[PDB]
């Protein structure tokens, strides 16, 4: 039950990353190597070769899209916009992370404004926590009742992927697998 995650025709935004539960079906991990090449393939707490011989209770697959340079933030103990306000991993994370370039699938001349991320928030994010709010962010107690202006900003920003950007700013598709023991 991996093809629908890796070969999905559309991927979710990072601020609303998709989660899929997997349980009750045998999984051949070798199939992952068939979707070559992977820009990053890093596992914490498990040997990639020995996964076929471990029977975990359940698995979770989280999928989203990010910039290339931000890919390093998907790891325990890291910090930044993605790590703080969009997607947090536990310090004792046990699972794998796969990321591959998608410049040919998620880049348009008009600029893909479909693919947003959260800029500012009043507090950090807990591990595997989500937040899909869209109320105006506030700086100063002069209330913003839903009117943009000074200190009243909508807290989402667009990636605006385009074909000509450098590798650092080009889109990357990310899938994170977590196992339950």
């Amino acid at each position, epitope marked *: 039950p991996f093809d629908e995650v890796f070969n999905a025709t559309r991927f979710a935004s990072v601020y609303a990353w998709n989660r899929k539960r997997i349980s009750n079906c045998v999984a051949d991990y070798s199939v992952l190597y068939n979707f070559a090449p992977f820009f990053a393939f890093k596992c914490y707490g498990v040997s990639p070769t020995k996964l076929n011989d471990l029977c975990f209770t359940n698995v979770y697959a989280d999928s989203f899209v990010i910039r290339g340079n931000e890919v390093s933030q998907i790891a325990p103990g890291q910090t930044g916009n993605i790590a703080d306000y969009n997607y947090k991993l536990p310090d004792d994370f046990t699972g794998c992370v796969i990321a591959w370039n998608s410049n040919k699938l998620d880049s348009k001349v008009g600029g893909n404004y479909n693919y947003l991320y959260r800029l500012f928030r009043k507090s*950090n994010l807990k591990p595997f926590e989500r937040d899909i709010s869209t109320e105006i962010y506030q700086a100063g107690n002069k209330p913003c009742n839903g009117v943009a202006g000074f*200190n009243c900003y909508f807290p989402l*920003r667009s990636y605006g992927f*385009r074909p000509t950007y*450098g590798v650092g700013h080009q889109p990357y598709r990310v899938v994170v697998l977590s196992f339950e023991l």
Partner: antibody
Amino acid sequence: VQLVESGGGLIQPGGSLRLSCAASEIIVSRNYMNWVRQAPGKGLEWVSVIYAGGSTFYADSVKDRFTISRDNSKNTLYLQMNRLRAEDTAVYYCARSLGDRFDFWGQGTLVTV
Amino acid sequence: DIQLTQSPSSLSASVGDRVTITCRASQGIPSYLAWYQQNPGRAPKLLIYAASTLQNGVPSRFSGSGSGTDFTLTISSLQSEDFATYYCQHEDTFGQGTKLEI
């Protein structure tokens, strides 16, 4: 709206000092706060930044020698600078970064070494 | 490590002329570029952001354009109060700076 810096002065070479940027009409614990510096006769140089979530970042050339913090009750920001060099002599500015913009700037304070 | 270079390092013009300034990046970047003004002995003042958006309170005569690796700031008409230093900034990188004269 105000962002006023205080603390700069003549400090001995390698001395330790603390610069306090006091705010008004903005809340330090809510925005992205930045310390920038300008050396006389040269362009601006970004020094350090702190997010509203508590994360901090510094330039690689001055890391482990500076420390950025705040006091939320007093809506103040603080930069502890240790082992100051004449190369650290400059006017330091307290800026609010709003996405990819430094919309609000302070008058800054002079640190001589 | 993306670098920003401004040009010309200095130019002189009379009152009422049209002025153009260029900021060029070492390699192609999105249009996340801002232009700031600074008078001697004063804190820098934001002028433009996104390379085309004018900040509130900025006079309408300032304009900006460009993309890819080259961006430009234009002043249609000068004035006695238009002579100062200008900087182009992207993320955490500031330009070398530019000067204007009467």
